Amino acid sequence: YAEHLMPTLQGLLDPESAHRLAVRFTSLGLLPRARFQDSDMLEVRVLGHKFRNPVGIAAGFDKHGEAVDGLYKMGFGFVEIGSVTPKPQEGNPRPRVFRLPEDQAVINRYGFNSHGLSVVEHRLRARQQKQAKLTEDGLPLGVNLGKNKTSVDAAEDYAEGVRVLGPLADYLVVNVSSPNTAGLRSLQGKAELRRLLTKVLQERDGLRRVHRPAVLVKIAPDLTSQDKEDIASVVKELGIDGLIVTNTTVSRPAGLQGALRSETGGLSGKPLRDLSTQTIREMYALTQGRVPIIGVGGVSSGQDALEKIRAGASLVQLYTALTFWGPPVVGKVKRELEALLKEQGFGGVTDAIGADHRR
Ligand SMILES: Cc1cc2c(cc1C)N(C[C@H](O)[C@H](O)[C@H](O)COP(=O)(O)O)c1[nH]c(=O)[nH]c(=O)c1N2
Ligand SMILES: O=C(O)c1cc(=O)[nH]c(=O)[nH]1
Ligand SMILES: [Cl-]
Ligand SMILES: [Cl-]
Ligand SMILES: [Cl-]
In DSSP terms, which residues pair with 145 in a beta bridge? Predict the structure, then answer.
């Protein structure tokens, strides 16, 4: 895979075609069931759920909820689908995703291509009780909500997503951090965020108890210090259940080598890694370690995962590493993380969460 398979599928196909085929293959279960059996050391209890291991698939890989079961088979401890927008929409014109192999990075400007809430609702309903069992067995499901390009009331878009997919999700994500929808990231500002999240939480609280998900906010890696302070304040004021830290970056860190480095879009993978880790670290401090963080950005190894956990993440996610290393990277991250936890004297993941802040 890392050397023998992915280079062929990568070089042979443009990245979007490769992704579509990967989703299809995954959905059909055409991957070996992951051999790595999860150690008890990797179990995490957070967000009202048991997570058999802390390595999830980040939003964007399975935008429309087509490959959830195949992703659990790949070894992910939790699956996040989306972003899902209220109405179907096509996203931006192609090409809209670009590989930067020399940087182990991707730039994407999909623009919330989405089958829409109704289609995803019916897809998740078809496996709703299967998911209930998976969740009880430590394999929760997150649903990441977006807003339509032409929406005239962003908060209502997210409210609709809460109402339609909230009952099918263990947690929901208010994605206010895509770089590829005009104006979306302004919803991270204090006043807009408070109003938006108040409405989202009211809608969530109006769901029946067994259908009431945790609500997390997914934030950018490009926030000012003021933005981060404001988000932390709003999250604590409103009782937001957690943060996902981070989405892709609109920055272009010095040193990128890929020919496509100046394409518009969000940058993911290795050049984002430490920017994301530092955002986790700051958000954990600003929330006094009381707000669960799902850490994401440039995770391709156990060390990458543990750095985010020690910075304050209770769980991590990855996407871009899968595009370069294929399915074996999941077990690799988990095996490496277990080894490092043992080496560094942690009894398990839980003991390592935020450990850097206690040094
Ligand atoms: C092609 C593609 C598409 C998407 C994403 C990424 C990529 C590469 N990401 C962001 C993703 O969830 C994650 O936050 C970043 O990509 C950082 O993680 P990695 O560096 O990829 O492990 C993303 N995030 C989100 O909240 N909703 C989405 O629809 C998408 N779509
Ligand atoms: O659909 C996309 O363009 C997209 C959404 C998002 O939240 N993040 C990202 O990098 N791309
Ligand atoms: Cl329901
Ligand atoms: Cl009722
Ligand atoms: Cl480490």
Answer: 84, 174
In the chain, what are the domains? 1-359 (3.20.20.70)
Distance CA 156, CA 334 (A): 39
Per the omega criterion (within 30 degrees of 0), is the bond before 8 cis? no
109 CB within 6 A, ligand 2: yes
Q: How many C-beta atoms surround the C-beta of residue 227 within 10 A?
A: 17
Cα(295) to centroid of ligand 5, in Å? 15
CA of 344, nearest ligand number: 5
Technique used by the depositors: X-ray
Please tell me if the CB atom of residue 83 comes closer than 6 angstroms to any atom of ligand 2.
yes
Q: Which two tokens stand for residue 65?
A: 């909820």
Separation of CA 180 and ligand 2 centre (Å): 6
Strands 44-46 and 49-51: antiparallel
What is the DSSP secondary structure assignment for residue 287, as one 8-state letter? T
Q: Please state, in angstroms and rounded to a whole number, the distance separating the CA atoms of residues 111 and 116.
A: 13
Residue given tokens 């996040």 in the structure block: 80
Distance CA(71)–CA(130), nearest Å, equals 14
